[PDB]
Amino acid sequence: GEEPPRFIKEPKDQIGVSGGVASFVCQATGDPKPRVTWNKKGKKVNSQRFETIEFDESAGAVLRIQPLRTPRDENVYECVAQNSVGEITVHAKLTVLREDQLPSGFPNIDMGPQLKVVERTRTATMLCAASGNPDPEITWFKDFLPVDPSASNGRIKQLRSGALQIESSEETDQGKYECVATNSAGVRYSSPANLYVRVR
């Protein structure tokens, strides 16, 4: 009844903007079920601008850096997965550009999401118009954690337009949403938008 840890979600190198945000996502499995931790050069990652959000019983961890500082935050970071029969490591590098030195094709948020208010049970759609070259792929974060529409059992859909849609809004859907535009050139976060649900 034992299996060493293995990464099922590995963090990727990122290129962010000064003042913006970067989130590295790391997740592992194994038996016993492992914990994952974020470190830098062996030391635990934890400061005012560096927060970790654990999920999946701590077998998952998001490292959110905000606001980004250059060149302070330009480093390699480590996600360490550990259980009783193994400890493994994956690396993710962070690059931080000044707004001044952004390449022309760097993702830009033409129109980010706004404060959303919706009557419980009704559909709420939050828009995100992003530009870039290549055309950025759009993802969303809720309360610092990545949203996964496909794993939402149909409660949440990402539209072809990049918009996030809640099919039948419940109180649980309230929170702080951010859209993220990512391409070969780097990553840019929209300003956050809160979603509030009002009584039916």
The reply on whether position 72 binds Na ion by CB under 5 A is no
**Pick 12 or 176: Cβ nearer Na ion:** 12
Terminal alpha carbon distance of the chain? 49
Q: What is the 3-state secondary structure (H, E, C) of 123-138?
A: CEEECCEEECCCCCEE
Binding site for Cl ion (CB under 5 A): 113-114, 126-127
| Nearest Cα residue to 92 out of 106, 79, 82 | 79
Using CB under 5 A, count the residues that bind Na ion. 4
Distance of CA 30 to the CA centre of its chain: 23
Residue 1 token pair: 């009844």
24 binds, among Cl ion, Na ion, none (CB under 5 to 8 A by kind): Na ion
Min. distance of Cβ 51 from Cl ion in angstroms?
Answer: 26
**Among residue numbers 18 through 57, which ones bind Na ion (CB under 5 A)?**
24-25
The DSSP output letter for 147 is: -
Which residues lie across from 35 on neighbouring strands? 82
CB of 115 to Cl ion, least distance (A): 8
11 binds, among Na ion, Cl ion, none (CB under 5 to 8 A by kind): Na ion
**Least distance between Cl ion and beta carbon 113 (Å):** 4
